[PDB]
Amino acid sequence: XXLXXX
Amino acid sequence: XEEXX
Amino acid sequence: XEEXX
Amino acid sequence: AVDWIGRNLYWTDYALETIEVSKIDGSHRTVLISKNVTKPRGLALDPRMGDNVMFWSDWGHHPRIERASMDGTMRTVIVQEKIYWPCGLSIDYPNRLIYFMDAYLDYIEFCDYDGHNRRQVIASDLVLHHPHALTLFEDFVYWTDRGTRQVMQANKWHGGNQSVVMYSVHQPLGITAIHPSRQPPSRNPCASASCSHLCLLSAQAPRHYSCACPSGWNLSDDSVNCVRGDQPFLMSVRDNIIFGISLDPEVKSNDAMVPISGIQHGYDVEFDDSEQFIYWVENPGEIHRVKTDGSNRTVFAPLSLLGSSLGLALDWVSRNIYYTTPASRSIEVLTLKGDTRYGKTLIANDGTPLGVGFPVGIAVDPARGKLYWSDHGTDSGVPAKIASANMDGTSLKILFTGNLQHLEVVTLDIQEQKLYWAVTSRGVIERGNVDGTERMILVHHLAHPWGLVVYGSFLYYSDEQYEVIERVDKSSGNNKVVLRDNVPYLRGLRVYHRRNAADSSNGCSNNPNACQQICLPVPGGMFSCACASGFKLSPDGRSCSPYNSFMVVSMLPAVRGFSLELSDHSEAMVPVAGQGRNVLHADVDVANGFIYWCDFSSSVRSSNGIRRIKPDGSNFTNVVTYGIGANGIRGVALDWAAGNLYFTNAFVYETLIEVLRINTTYRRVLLKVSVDMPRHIIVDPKHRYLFWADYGQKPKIERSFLDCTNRTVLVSEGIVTPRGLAMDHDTGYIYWVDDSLDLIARIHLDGGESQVVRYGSRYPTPYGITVFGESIIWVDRNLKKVFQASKQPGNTDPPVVIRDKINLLRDVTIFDEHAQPLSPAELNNNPCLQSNGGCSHFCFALPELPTPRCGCAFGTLGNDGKSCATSQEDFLIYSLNNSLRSLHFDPRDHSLPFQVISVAGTAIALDYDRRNNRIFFTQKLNSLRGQISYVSLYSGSSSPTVLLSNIGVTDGIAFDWINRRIYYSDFSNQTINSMAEDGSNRAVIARVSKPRAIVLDPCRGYMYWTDWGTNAKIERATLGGNFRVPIVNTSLVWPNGLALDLET
Amino acid sequence: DGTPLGVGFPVGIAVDPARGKLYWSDHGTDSGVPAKIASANMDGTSLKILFTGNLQHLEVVTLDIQEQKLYWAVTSRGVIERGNVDGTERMILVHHLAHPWGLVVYGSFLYYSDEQYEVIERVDKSSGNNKVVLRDNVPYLRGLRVYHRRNAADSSNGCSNNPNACQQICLPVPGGMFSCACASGFKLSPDGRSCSPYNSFMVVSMLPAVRGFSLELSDHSEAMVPVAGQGRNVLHADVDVANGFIYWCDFSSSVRSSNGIRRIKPDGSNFTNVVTYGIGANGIRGVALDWAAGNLYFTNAFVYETLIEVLRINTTYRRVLLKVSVDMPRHIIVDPKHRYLFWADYGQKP
């Protein structure tokens, strides 16, 4: 999972 | 998670 | 059909 | 994170890169920490008296965990070693430990408030994949993983005794444990504070509170009272957000106002300091507004039904807002005052260069009543230019033209009467006087200027390709100063400042409430009253009345009306557009104020049909929906005298000419053809004739009576693909257009030779035509223009262009009382003008006779000659879904023997009873609930009377006229049973695998039926059900139908 | 290039074999070349701007060699215009066109096709005058040309008088002279007739392709056969001057086997994969070649790890030098002269 919450 | 076309 | 857009 | 002691509310914003605080009511918000912060994720705080401290986590280019006093003063860094992705924070209040987490190094750790006693709870472990947030309880720590999508529990001191609390389908981000122990009480020093607006707790010993005030407010020397800051600031609108940044380049906070987030495609903004509102457009064709502090973010008004607006400019004296609609090639106005919105189109795209080609920017001068806009031009007469006009849209003028390729927004310096604009093709910003005399290049070597604004002695511009906002001296373009840099998606600019309407009053302010709807200032201190779209100004100069004379231009996306005078660019009707519009032709009803059109769709149903609407956009209702062919309605003609609406619906291999009496259900077919395909139909109540065009094999133009009985051909030679035709009633000529011949021609009603009005290469695709006075008006699909030219053949004057660059033109019609006369003398004493001529259903006049030929929608015309009754003859009857319908034996008779009977459920089979004149029919409800009913064919025509219910699905029914009992078959129950005509006694005749149909021969005592089960056969038995034998039991699979002929 | 004399967006071409001059119509570029009618020698030497002005939607250009006048059509104004090759006299010939697409001048008549009027018309070449329609109701009209007899005897130049003069390409110039040229990736020899590979040039790498440009700005030719086509997504490139190779690393987030390091000679031959196996989730993020020892250094970019590797050219030996997790080397340059490696890091702690 990527960091950016979007 | 980097640059691509 | 004949014309639709 | 809520502050339960000081009653405040803190949060971290990743997009804004700030830490913000407000009251727990969501009011008086301010940016608390905006310096030196890149990606703030975590947040925790300790409101107790001894601490008054907050913590946040930033995972920017230098990750760190920082602490500060809750008023943001004493900021220190407590953790900046062994961290890559600080994600989530939590506080252990009893022992004052701060727990934090890392999604890259995959650990959970805690420290004291100084970050000294650092320990590892969970580390060097695979239980953590991408943990996000955590919360504490008594000796337990809970956290959420965005990688494994589950919530976990572990011992908060050493990470033992782990277990999965919850599995979640989506990624679990937030988590909190709700309990009073998590929210310890304490004394509230802020409760005694006298601070206005915000009172924030602080760690300073003497008081432990500090007064603060929201964005755009000033801290007075009293240190407790704040005053609103009236200093100007720059509104930097960007592709998805609008920021208010200070004019001082040293202030890098971006908190002059609450940011306007959630923008779809931002281009430019506009403000009203009288009510502190900020205006911007939205893509669906709306204008939104919000106060500078975010109180009433709401929609305000709809801008245009046929495209989104791009430019924006506000008049702060007349309280009108002007906008440009490049999708509609128009400059429009909207009214702010009052609870009712009024909008108008000022300038449109005529053929002249003075018109509007493609408006980009707009700047208004409320005093002196002047309006300026920048035009990209078109592939037409309109060039790229800087143009000016009065704010009532009258005096169009071209100020500057030349090498203005890729023009940008235009800005007016009111104090100096100097226009400013940017040119992307040369990368320069130019300026010039409002009179168009002087022009010089001010700034050079720009990449892609987007916004520019003049305030005071400086000119601010934002470059979208350098990603920079720069301030330069407006007089010479020297002394460049950079305000922002590395900001992507830079868009237009505007400076918010207080501007008084009193110092710049005009006509619309000295005379308020003079005009009924809209006031527009003009040069010289005067004012010009105006009306909203669809209304014309009355001769008194103040009131408004609807347009009584306009042309109705039909396009595929929308139906639009224009005034007959070319000097008026106002929209003469409220446009019909939006979802579901794909319109072929239009027709008008001038007397009643209705405009009819036919929508068409080749794929989705319920889009085909004829619909009506008033020219002001009220009481849209459907007209014809049922029974539309596969090719849809292809032509609409309205008889304004008799109130009949003729239309042609085309099937795949057939086409019908059909009449509907308006405001009534009377509808009948006049003509059914297969070789001919009538497409566009017109009606003439004066000469009492019906004309239509045909463009299939053997193209022609036909003339016929109102009942389609005396068809004759007018033109059949030298005609291919006649798209449309029109008539001038005062002269009696038929005008038509040929796109396949590039020909516009006319012919008299009685026949003769065809006269060529206009032809040649310059008329590629005429699609629709109309006649008004001495001039014809027609639309051209290829040229995207609506033309006007002399009706007389042999004229060589070039056509004048009413409007240009209209896509998908189809038709044009005149909405005028002069084009639809109603007086009996002007209609040649046409019948059906009074009481529909006495006819019950339809009133068809004949060319020279004084008495009308009444028509019958259902049934036959009686001896009275004006009333309708049942056929009293032989005819067919069939069931169609939830109805029983009738049909004559004659293929050339299209009248219905009786009106369609509506039943409940689906009708499957039926049979007729002579003696009582009734039809016994069966119904199917649900999967298995069959039903049998009967309905009378007499004038009473009551609801069908049920005979049974709860019986299975019934596939057939037959009536014994001799023995007066009813035979029917039950499919779902595998029996054929009988009944008396009253119901009453019922008996079973036989068992059958799959019975469908039954036929009887009472005079010979035999009864036949069919079966299509495992073996399909036709069986015979006596009416009592005895001596059953199969008549045919070979070569049958699905013998659905049975019929017995006693005559042979 | 940045100068107005270069091509911005060329649409049409007219060639004058005798007198050796090219003519072309340009749409221009933003903040660069304007929309103009330009001319140059057929070898490309003397760029010139003939007509500039109200040309916005400029269409193809054409030349009447017998009268030596240029013709062009402007869609934004709906006109067909004339102009001398000197760039002096300019005038409007036809009015009220819709969307001219093609035009040709032959004999005493000018033929033009209008795509929006769907028509082909003939007018005199001195003025509109006698308009005649050849075809009508013709959709999708495009450019036009007149097939006619023109011979090498009625007009001659240097390249026709002297066959076999240049080994690869001959380009005539005004005055009857001829200029030799040598393909793409080759440079003209000092003798002026033979060809040699472009010994000195510079390499620029784009995501779609790798291209080579000469250091001397007057040479607009490609100094290297471009590396392009399907499967190309270039992040970095490095050169091997002695052996004549160009090394580049492809990238692809979705499709595998589009990741790795390739080599190619500047003339377009001997394409070969150098590194294919063991590429990280993010591709080779940097390449550096040691031209002394023959070592190739490159960076593997895994999702949470980053390796610095060596590969001996023409040899299967491949080694990992460094494995880091908090630091992420991205672009590597090698200096054999001082025997050092420098790499740039743009993650946390740049």
Ligand SMILES: *[C@@H]1O[C@H](CO)[C@@H](O[C@@H]2O[C@H](CO)[C@@H](O[C@@H]3O[C@H](CO[C@H]4O[C@H](CO)[C@@H](O)[C@H](O)[C@@H]4O)[C@@H](O)[C@H](O[C@H]4O[C@H](CO)[C@@H](O)[C@H](O)[C@@H]4O)[C@@H]3O)[C@H](O)[C@H]2NC(C)=O)[C@H](O)[C@H]1NC(C)=O
């Ligand atoms: C809340 O706090 C803010 C910030 O401290 C205050 O904002 C300042 O308010 C003053 C007074 O209105 C402003 O001073 C005026 O500046 C004008 C030009 O400013 C521009 O250029 C300067 C640099 O040259 C920039 O710093 C600035 O951002 C602008 O870009 C001058 O033209 C004015 O001079 C005129 O008025 C004065 C005083 O009457 C006369 O002496 C002069 O002769 C002349 O007529 C004036 O100096 C100041 O620019 C504002 N700063 C900002 C950031 O905008 C608020 O005033 C304060 N609010 C309250 C009510 O306390």
Ligand SMILES: *[C@@H]1O[C@H](CO)[C@@H](O[C@@H]2O[C@H](CO)[C@@H](O[C@@H]3O[C@H](CO[C@H]4O[C@H](CO)[C@@H](O)[C@H](O)[C@@H]4O)[C@@H](O)[C@H](O[C@H]4O[C@H](CO)[C@@H](O)[C@H](O)[C@@H]4O)[C@@H]3O)[C@H](O)[C@H]2NC(C)=O)[C@H](O)[C@H]1NC(C)=O
């Ligand atoms: C099918 O059913 C529809 C309704 O669903 C009918 O539509 C109505 O048609 C009548 C006319 O037949 C309309 O009545 C007309 O309204 C006009 C507008 O009135 C406004 O403006 C006038 C001043 O111009 C004001 O006085 C008034 O207060 C309103 O503000 C009037 O201008 C018309 O007046 C004309 O006729 C009357 C007599 O009826 C004369 O006295 C006048 O001098 C003048 O000649 C008229 O009153 C009505 O508005 C329509 N209703 C709707 C909802 O649209 C269809 O007629 C009906 N039939 C068909 C075939 O469609």
Ligand SMILES: *[C@@H]1O[C@H](CO)[C@@H](O[C@@H]2O[C@H](CO)[C@@H](O[C@@H]3O[C@H](CO[C@H]4O[C@H](CO)[C@@H](O)[C@H](O)[C@@H]4O)[C@@H](O)[C@H](O[C@H]4O[C@H](CO)[C@@H](O)[C@H](O)[C@@H]4O)[C@@H]3O)[C@H](O)[C@H]2NC(C)=O)[C@H](O)[C@H]1NC(C)=O
């Ligand atoms: C891995 O393996 C590849 C092959 O797969 C090697 O590639 C070869 O490398 C050699 C290096 O020497 C190349 O040979 C060179 O070719 C040059 C071009 O030759 C043309 O032009 C010359 C005149 O300049 C003509 O004589 C010749 O016929 C061609 O028309 C030459 O200019 C070079 O000359 C040098 O060596 C010669 C012979 O010793 C000397 O006389 C010269 O003075 C000069 O020093 C040289 O011959 C060869 O072309 C490459 N082949 C391919 C397929 O590209 C790689 O080198 C190897 N990798 C590593 C890192 O070693």
Ligand SMILES: *[C@@H]1O[C@H](CO)[C@@H](O[C@@H]2O[C@H](CO)[C@@H](O)[C@H](O)[C@H]2NC(C)=O)[C@H](O)[C@H]1NC(C)=O
């Ligand atoms: C923002 O962070 C930077 C980087 O740490 C700070 O810059 C240093 O601040 C210290 C404070 O003692 C100085 O000693 C250094 O000389 C500063 N270096 C530079 C390059 O300026 C900066 O102070 C921080 N600012 C705030 C308000 O937190």
Ligand SMILES: *[C@@H]1O[C@H](CO)[C@@H](O[C@@H]2O[C@H](CO)[C@@H](O)[C@H](O)[C@H]2NC(C)=O)[C@H](O)[C@H]1NC(C)=O
């Ligand atoms: C999980 O909980 C159990 C108790 O239910 C822990 O087991 C005891 O832990 C204490 C403290 O370390 C020891 O003194 C005991 O000897 C342990 N007893 C047993 C039965 O093991 C256990 O430590 C917890 N999990 C982990 C891995 O720490």
Ligand SMILES: *[C@@H]1O[C@H](CO)[C@@H](O[C@@H]2O[C@H](CO)[C@@H](O)[C@H](O)[C@H]2NC(C)=O)[C@H](O)[C@H]1NC(C)=O
């Ligand atoms: C902006 O928001 C405030 C708060 O909702 C609006 O004020 C309320 O208006 C309603 C309806 O008139 C009243 O019943 C409430 O008592 C008002 N509350 C307050 C706090 O005054 C205000 O109307 C909005 N502004 C506008 C003009 O729409």
Ligand SMILES: *[C@@H]1O[C@H](CO)[C@@H](O[C@@H]2O[C@H](CO)[C@@H](O)[C@H](O)[C@H]2NC(C)=O)[C@H](O)[C@H]1NC(C)=O
């Ligand atoms: C065919 O008949 C059925 C009933 O047998 C119709 O179903 C009804 O449809 C209307 C909407 O038009 C619903 O409001 C009713 O609730 C439906 N009734 C039942 C019993 O389901 C159906 O619409 C008819 N089909 C068509 C094309 O008209």
Ligand SMILES: *[C@@H]1O[C@H](CO)[C@@H](O[C@@H]2O[C@H](CO)[C@@H](O)[C@H](O)[C@H]2NC(C)=O)[C@H](O)[C@H]1NC(C)=O
């Ligand atoms: C199809 O129908 C014929 C009707 O005659 C059946 O033929 C009869 O079959 C029975 C039993 O075999 C005989 O007793 C009769 O004499 C036959 N009648 C005649 C005149 O041929 C035939 O059996 C039927 N077929 C099936 C498969 O049922």
Ligand SMILES: *[C@@H]1O[C@H](CO)[C@@H](O)[C@H](O)[C@H]1NC(C)=O
């Ligand atoms: C026409 O419009 C008005 C406004 O909706 C409405 O009140 C009136 O009833 C409408 N007329 C009819 C007959 O529906």
Ligand SMILES: *[C@@H]1O[C@H](CO)[C@@H](O)[C@H](O)[C@H]1NC(C)=O
């Ligand atoms: C209409 O049709 C009838 C029957 O074909 C014909 O006798 C008559 O002349 C036609 N025209 C008139 C004037 O009724």
Ligand SMILES: *[C@@H]1O[C@H](CO)[C@@H](O)[C@H](O)[C@H]1NC(C)=O
């Ligand atoms: C069939 O007959 C049965 C009982 O013999 C009755 O219950 C039922 O209503 C009939 N058909 C249906 C609806 O199942």
Ligand SMILES: *[C@@H]1O[C@H](CO)[C@@H](O)[C@H](O)[C@H]1NC(C)=O
């Ligand atoms: C290199 O290219 C030449 C010519 O295409 C070919 O004959 C030769 O085999 C190639 N050599 C290698 C090692 O790729």
Ligand SMILES: [Ca+2]
């Ligand atoms: Ca991880």
Ligand SMILES: [Ca+2]
């Ligand atoms: Ca045509």
Ligand code: NI
């Ligand atoms: Ni632009």
Ligand code: NI
């Ligand atoms: Ni074109």
